[PDB]
Amino acid sequence: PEGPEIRRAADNLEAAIKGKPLTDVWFAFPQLKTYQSQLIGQHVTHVETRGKALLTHFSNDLTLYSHNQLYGVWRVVDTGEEPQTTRVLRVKLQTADKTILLYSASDIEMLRPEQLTTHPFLQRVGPDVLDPNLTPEVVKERLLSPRFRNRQFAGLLLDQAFLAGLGNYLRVEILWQVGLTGNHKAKDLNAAQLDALAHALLEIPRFSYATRGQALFRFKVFHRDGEPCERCGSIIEKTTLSSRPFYWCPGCQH
DNA sequence: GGCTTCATCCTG
DNA sequence: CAGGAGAAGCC
Length: 254
Ligand SMILES: [Zn+2]
Fold this sequence. Notes:
The chain is α+β, with helices and mostly antiparallel strands. The chain folds into two domains: 126 residues, Alpha-Beta Barrel (N-terminal domain of MutM-like DNA repair proteins), CATH 3.20.190.10; 128 residues, Orthogonal Bundle (Helicase, Ruva Protein, domain 3), CATH 1.10.8.50. The chain is 29% helix and 22% strand. Pfam families: Fapy_DNA_glyco, H2TH, zf-FPG_IleRS.
């Protein structure tokens, strides 16, 4: 679950409980139990995302921070229901008709307003690819900036200090769209390629966010090793890059 | 900045 | 059951 999936999840959390008084609040972690009585009768005002960090803002200026890493998942249920699962329940936010449940996540903390800028992840993350105010022109400037122009794309496109919300499938899909492998730096691209990359860094995550739940998003190379590339027909390969799986086409990525 | 450790779930 | 599937820890 990368930035598009976490924003889709947050949209669902809002549809379920934004604005509604909380009738029960439960946390598994001992250090969070103190907030349960404090939040009953308060409500979620908005569910903000910054990449894969999810920020559940409450009406008393507290914010729950949660990050699913590789395994956390939210579920929306009718109040009082809890489908059998063997996942460990970590958070429950309950209203009169809907409840939201966070399973399995281990990075969960309660933030004061000041911490929204000083928390170690929140302080480090870059601009979010799903932020509609972020433009291809600003992304181009960021690629060519002294800070990032000498960074290899293999790790750059996983680094949330560069652009928040990119993960491994988006890395693989964006590099294939622009015909590049991971072993390039922005300083070495021509202007056409830099512009293509800046656009793809925003447009592919936005297209996944808009249509993966639903022209619709599809993987061109992720998990398609052994299949022919739909652009050039070469057989897609699986290898490792940056200590993560990597999918690419040897016929049209260079 | 790139490699190894944490963390939970699911597979082969 | 050991190893695969996002970032926080050690230089
Ligand atoms: Zn190809």
